[PDB]
């Protein structure tokens, strides 16, 4: 049984690897198709354990990945993309 202390510590609000849809991060073009269609990103996770507190990113950076953009029957190219990452998270009103 995992101890309350470890559950509390490990689940408390903090940046965690999160698999995000590229289409959610780029709704503007549903024209292409991306391989992989989802990407790992450090994002805010956990709970602040308060009613009146939410978890927001404080520090944010930019990561760059090689992804396949694929236009069906029109051809497919490989390139770089930039995604947002969360370097720090805080519990705030």
């Amino acid at each position: 049984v995992v101890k309350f202390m470890d559950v509390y510590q490990r689940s408390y609000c903090h940046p965690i690897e999160t698999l995000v849809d590229i289409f959610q991060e780029y709704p503007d073009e549903i024209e292409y198709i991306f391989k992989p269609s989802c990407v790992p990103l450090m994002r805010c996770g956990g709970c602040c354990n308060d009613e009146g507190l939410e978890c927001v990113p404080t520090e944010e950076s930019n990561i760059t990945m090689q992804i396949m953009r694929i236009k069906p029957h029109q051809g497919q190219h490989i390139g770089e993309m930039s995604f947002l990452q969360h370097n720090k998270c805080e519990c705030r009103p």
């Binding site: 101890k3 309350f4 202390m5 470890d6 509390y8 510590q9 408390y12 354990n49 308060d50 009613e51």
Partner: protein, 32 residues
Amino acid sequence: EXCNXRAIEAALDPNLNDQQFHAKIWXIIXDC
């Protein structure tokens, strides 16, 4: 373990509030 002890007795205190208890346990996590 005495650490997880402290963290449980903290949590059982009715007369506390979320944020005070929050502080109290995150002393036992700051240390242990």
